[PDB]
Symmetry: C3
Subunit: 95 residues, 3 copies
């Protein structure tokens, strides 16, 4: 196993392509996205359901870079939460 | 910058969607996230019968972030007290690092 | 009230029954599966934003057991199918045993 960072982004379904774009252009080796629903307290939803991304990265800087861009671009105008933890991933994959 | 917060996960029957949701909101959590799920478990208490269909999406997974470990286990306590014996559910708690942005 | 381990397996949806059996045939109390989509870098997919993946979560009382399931899944399918796995620790009530 190899210790890596795990960035989670939960945001509006309409931002699927844009956030996928950010992740890939930052140089992450991939991402996973799950369909979700939710409620939050900011009440900023651009449309008046959600997606949850998980991005594993070996470097904390890359996780921070992706988090920073997503938050800077979409936090004010779109339902969006992010958080980071660490996990131990398989060594047979690049992160 | 950042904030160490608690993440409560509840995995239970889909039929408890609104009841568990209201537990979360009434206890004062800033929000929650819920995903449809399938699964198998060993307690064998699914309210609709066993042996159940293993790959039907009959479950839901909640994630609740809170800054207070007291609020997390207040939610978990209640959920377990009301539904654990009667419904196929399961819970666990971790910590994650969030930005001091959201009031959790 | 007790530390347990969480094994996550993200793989092709077509492996749902095969991987579920490995988790079961191994000895894990249960497992949770969620529909998923994604992209990776190996480009081994046997068949982007289509929900063509699945995400397994398996809670185990022991790190050993989590490693065993991970090992069996990777051994059988990693080369031939899109697949990643990771392990973290979480806290669970004693009222459930894993
Ligand atoms: N404390 C929390 N725990 C878990 N998930 C949360 C929490 N707060 C918010 N979320 C998730 O983040 C999403 C967006 O919440 P946010 O507060 O940023 O925007 P919002 O406009 O209030 O969202 P919504 O329109 O869904 O109420 C929610 O739909 C929910 O899925
Ligand atoms: N060890 C585990 N790891 C991950 N998820 C689990 C585990 N055990 C149970 N689950 C999840 O919790 C749900 C409830 O399982 P539980 O054992 O409480 O009830 P059950 O009635 O046996 O469930 P089922 O009818 O699905 O077999 C399961 O369907 C599964 O999604
Ligand atoms: N760095 C990462 N962070 C989060 N999830 C990832 C990461 N890399 C891969 N994944 C997930 O694992 C799955 C398998 O990717 P893998 O690289 O093993 O095969 P792949 O054939 O390149 O995948 P795909 O056909 O989706 O491009 C991906 O679809 C994605 O869901
Ligand atoms: Cl998830």
């Amino acid at each position: 196993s190899q210790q890596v960072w795990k960035l989670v982004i939960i945001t509006e379904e309409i931002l699927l392509k844009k956030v996928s774009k950010i992740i890939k252009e930052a140089g992450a080796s991939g991402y996973t996205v799950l369909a979700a629903a939710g409620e939050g307290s900011r009440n900023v939803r651009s449309t008046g359901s959600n997606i949850k991304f998980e991005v594993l990265t070996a470097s904390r800087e890359l996780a921070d870079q992706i988090q920073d861009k997503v938050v800077a671009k979409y936090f004010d105008d779109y339902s969006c939460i992010t958080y980071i933890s660490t996990v131990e991933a398989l060594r047979a994959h690049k992160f």
